[PDB]
Design a protein around this nucleic acid. Structure first.
Lengths: 534, 175, 103
RNA sequence: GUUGAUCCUGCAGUCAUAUGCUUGUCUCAAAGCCAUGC
RNA sequence: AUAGUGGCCUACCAUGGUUUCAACGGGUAACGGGGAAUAAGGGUUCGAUUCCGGAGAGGGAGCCUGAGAAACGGCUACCACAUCCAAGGAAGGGCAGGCGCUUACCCAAUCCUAAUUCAGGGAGGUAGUGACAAUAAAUAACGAUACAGGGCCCAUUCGGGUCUUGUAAUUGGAAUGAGUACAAUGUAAAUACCUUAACGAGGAACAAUUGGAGUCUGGUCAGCAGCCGCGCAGCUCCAAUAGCGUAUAUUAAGCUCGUAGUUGAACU
């Protein structure tokens, strides 16, 4: 409530409205984009150099964003931060099982003001049956998904697209209807990059090598909480890693001064102002005689009773200089203590919708924790008696496990996103979803119960007087373990009486019932061996 | 149509399974429409019973009540004295539908296959191919109940699905 | 309720029950404070699981038991149940007909 | 004109509020905030 | 005085004028009715009326055109009021409309006008919009053979009655149209609507449920020994049908007198 409340007041016209046009790359999104800026700038601009600042009135500034479905990371990255998702559809999607999984991504990141727009339906259909198909796709989304949504139907009038009332209806819905707040995004200061400049500290032999990082000066406008609150703080760059800011800049007898001037002793602060160790809890007082004489009278206490930024970096290093490009949009993240630190963390999980595989402990996963994403080996476990007694190596339809693994440690227990990577030539989206839930709880230095089974088959049994034909082969092991308590698969207690000088599996052992020949004498509580670290 | 007062009355629900299995129905609201049609008629018959004999309202509309029932085939000839329409039964209404009367005129060999015939643009009353199972036969088009000129068993076209079996033989055994 | 048929509240904590059939497993209750009133009332979760699903601190919807108060079976003293957490209609999440939002 | 026993039988309606699932074909369903213009 | 009689307005003179089968005065939140419908004509809905009247075009006054405006969808001036500024000045009237509870096309019709056989008509005509209701009905039809029967019902019972029955694509030809498409009609230019050559079934079909039960089948747990034991996944039946449920509420079993007040004999 308060974390959404701090966002509404300082933000005005120079912080723009976040616009993310996200759809399939096969469609002509660019015509609708340049049509949208034909509504903004007078009638005459149809060139794309985005992202860039477009000044349109004092009401709202609007910066427009785009990303293809062929890029994998920004498919994650734009979803948690967008105030507006504009989905354009073709007339042949809806049970396309490989290129529509981003809907679940926007679900798990949280739904902003989102849009469905149908334009290639004009290019595909030419009969009266499209009116039923429009309503059917409306029964698919978003009206199935969220109540109060609108489906926009527009013309295929490719280059040469209208300036007329339809773009004023789209921009009517964009300009009038505003967003809904997000919990942990507003808990952090985050800045999208707008202008990207590079300074090299002019030419020297130290300005280039195998390892040389230069002075990257980056610029833009702020969103969320104000980022200048502490200099030299930590930061995350998505896809590259964690860093700290080199220098932060922003372009939109006084005792309180005497405290934090550290070149002055505190006796000089008191002495210039008026007129040692806190390990002693009892405060200072005067002498018993002076305080007694002064407090002969008690009169003296008788009333006591009844935004633009200019940001400096000495990063990135040399290898990402070769990774320069026209800017596919990168937002800046924010690192925090009790989240920057590492630890074993336990997460609660469930299975993806329209998902067709099992999820094993041994197949590493990409994990979206806030602004972070880590490939990590997902070790599973379950309880069956309000405590851990077993573990599982894969994820069936039967139950759904809880994950325990060494990752980064995060106390506030953020929501969870577990994505399995596919290549850019397998299905059609940058990732395929494995599991989702919340970070359950924080637990380091914990140990998993890994129990196993020892096989012993009974054949002719009495209660206290019994032999097994084959469960062991050594009398010394049984002699070491005669003090233990042996079990049976139906739950019959027992203990080893003695190996009785027979290293053959025959040995005297007691039970509290005669063991069934359909039952098996077993042993549990086995070795808990270590976590996979990665 | 209208719903009855009791939703679960077992021997009442016994005979509803009897008639719908007899007459080849598919809904109980189909039964409820026939009873609701009867409910208004059998209402108005009591009102003319409260009137005097040879009352011209009882003479005009009471005998027009007769002639509408003599037309549809329900009312017999001997019982044309305004009292059998109080002593009626609902199965006489279910008798007069063309769904069963085509089976009463042989030719259908099932009460369920007959419904299958009706929906497939079969039997024309005269020149009028009808696709409504609730016609309430006019009692004079009964012998005119006959197949269409098309839609075979009335001939003049085999139909494309018989032409596929014609094509499956003439191309495989032929060329 | 104030005589009403439904009300909207927020989960503050999640309790634990147990069962007898087919084994002993937790059957789940919670404590939900009314938004309009501030009264915190116990509520039951009729399903298997769904302790996984609901949460602490979520804004939920409440309904009755259809016995005019009057706790159903061996559940001592609960008079209400949850049908919609976050307005998502639990049964939709029960098969997989819906996916839970950001919070 | 008055006491007891034996036998037998007995001891659902709501277009009226909100909500959920699904529908091949046909028909019928303010004294607040402002998009836009003079 | 006006287009025109006329207190319509003024100077003088008179003191009159209306009304108990009721002048005037007062209420009817229905701005006025004829009129359209169900058809008691009573009533209801509309009178913001399908036709006409009174009031308003930010608020005042004067004046103009036309046969006809009392133009305001005429002008000027005044008052409120506000946009630009080269700094001089210029200009518009506080107005619609949307949400809170997406509007496109044509003068082909009817009439009107015409600089009138031409053409136009913010007259007029066509298109968009959908479970609170609701209409018609599609999901399979008919044969075939072979091994086969501890088959069903009722009484939770103790038991009795009735054995015409299924397990198999064994398998076979029918068939229609959901949907795909020339041509024609229509033609506001014009679209839909009503027609129809040519495609479209052997169960993955051309993909229906919300449910209700269940003494069934499976999985190491309060807690215990001397001996014996505790409590998701496969299967079956029932339901109405594009319909059904849920929650709430609702329906059916101390004494007396004595005022206002009530009541009351017979009769040529």
């Amino acid at each position: 409530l308060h974390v959404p409340m701090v966002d509404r007041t300082p933000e005005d016209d120079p912080p723009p409205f976040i616009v993310a046009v996200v759809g399939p790359p096969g469609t002509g999104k660019t015509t609708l984009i340049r049509s949208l800026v034909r509504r903004m700038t007078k009638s005459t601009l149809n060139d794309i150099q985005g992202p860039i600042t477009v000044v349109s009135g004092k009401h709202r500034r609007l910066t427009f964003l785009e990303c293809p479905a062929d890029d994998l990371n920004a498919m994650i990255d734009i979803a948690k931060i967008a105030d507006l998702v504009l989905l354009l559809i073709d007339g042949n999607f809806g049970f396309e099982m490989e290129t529509m999984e981003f809907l679940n991504i926007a679900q798990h990141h949280g739904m902003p003001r989102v849009l469905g727009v149908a334009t290639h339906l004009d290019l595909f259909k030419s009969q009266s049956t499209l009116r039923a198909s429009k309503k059917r796709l409306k029964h698919r989304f978003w009206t199935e998904v969220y109540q109060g949504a609108k489906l926009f139907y527009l013309s295929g009038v490719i280059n040469g697209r209208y300036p007329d009332r339809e773009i004023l209806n789209l921009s009517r819905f964009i300009s009038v209807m505003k967003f809904r707040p997000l919990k942990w995004r507003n808990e952090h200061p985050y800045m999208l990059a707008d202008r990207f400049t590079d300074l090299t500290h002019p030419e020297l032999i130290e300005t280039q090598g195998l390892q040389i990082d230069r002075k990257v000066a980056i610029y833009g406008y702020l969103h969320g909480t104000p980022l200048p609150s502490a200099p030299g703080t930590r930061v995350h760059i998505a896809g590259v890693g964690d860093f700290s800011v080199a220098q932060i800049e922003k372009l939109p007898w006084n005792i309180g001064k005497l405290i934090y001037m550290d070149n002055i002793s505190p006796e000089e602060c008191i002495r210039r102002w008026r007129g040692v160790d806190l390990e002693k809890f009892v405060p200072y007082f005067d002498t018993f005689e002076k305080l007694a004489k002064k407090w002969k009278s008690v009169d003296a206490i008788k009333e006591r009773f009844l935004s633009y930024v200019r940001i400096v970096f000495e990063k990135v290093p040399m290898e990402f200089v070769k990774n320069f490009n026209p800017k596919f949009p990168i937002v800046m993240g924010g690192l925090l203590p009790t989240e920057i630190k590492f630890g074993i963390v336990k997460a609660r999980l469930r299975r993806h919708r329209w998902h067709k595989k099992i999820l094993k402990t041994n197949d590493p996963l990409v994990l979206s924790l806030g602004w972070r994403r880590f490939q990590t080996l997902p070790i599973y476990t379950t309880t069956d008696s309000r405590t851990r007694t077993r573990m599982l190596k894969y994820t069936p339809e039967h139950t759904y496990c809880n994950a325990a693994f060494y990752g980064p440690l995060c106390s506030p227990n953020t929501p969870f996103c577990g994505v399995q990577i596919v290549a850019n030539s397998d299905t059609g989206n940058g990732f395929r979803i494995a599991a989702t839930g919340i970070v359950e709880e924080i637990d380091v230095n914990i140990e998993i119960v890994k129990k196993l089974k020892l096989v012993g088959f009974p054949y002719k049994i009495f209660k206290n007087t019994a032999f097994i034909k084959d469960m062991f082969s050594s009398a010394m092991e049984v002699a070491r373990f005669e003090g233990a308590q042996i079990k049976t698969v139906s739950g019959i207690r027992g203990e080893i009486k003695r190996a009785l000088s027979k290293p053959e599996g025959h040995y005297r052992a007691a039970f509290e019932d005669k063991i069934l020949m359909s039952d098996i004498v077993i042993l549990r509580s086995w070795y808990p061996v270590r976590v996979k670290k990665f | 149509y209208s719903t009855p007062k009791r939703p679960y009355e077992s021997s009442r629900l016994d005979a509803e399974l009897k008639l719908a299995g007899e007459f080849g129905l598919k809904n109980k609201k189909e039964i409820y429409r026939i009873s609701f049609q009867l409910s208004k008629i059998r209402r108005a018959a009591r009102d003319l019973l409260t009137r005097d004999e040879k009352d011209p309202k009882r003479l005009f509309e009471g005998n027009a009540l007769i002639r509408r029932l003599v037309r549809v085939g329900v009312l017999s000839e001997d019982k044309k004295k305004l009292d059998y329409v109080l002593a009626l039964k609902v199965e006489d209404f279910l008798e007069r539908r063309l769904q069963t009367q085509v089976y009463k005129l042989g030719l259908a060999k099932s009460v369920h296959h007959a419904r299958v015939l009706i929906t497939q643009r079969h039997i024309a009353v005269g020149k009028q191919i009808v696709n409504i199972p609730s016609f309430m036969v006019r009692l004079d088009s009964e012998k005119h109940i006959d197949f269409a000129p098309t839609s075979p068993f009335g001939g003049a076209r085999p139909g494309r699905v018989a032409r596929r079996n014609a094509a499956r033989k003439a191309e495989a055994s032929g060329e | 309720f104030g005589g009403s048929s439904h009300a909207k509240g927020i989960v503050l904590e999640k309790l634990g029950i147990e069962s007898k059939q087919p084994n002993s497993a937790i059957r789940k209750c919670v404590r939900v404070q009314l938004i309009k009133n501030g009264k915190k009332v116990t509520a039951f979760v009729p399903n298997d699981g769904c302790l996984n699903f609901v949460d602490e601190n979520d804004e939920v919807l409440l309904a009755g038991f259809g016995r005019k108060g009057k706790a159903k079976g061996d559940i001592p003293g609960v008079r209400f149940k949850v049908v919609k957490v976050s307005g998502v209609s639990l049964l939709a999440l029960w098969k997989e007909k819906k996916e839970k939002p950001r919070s």
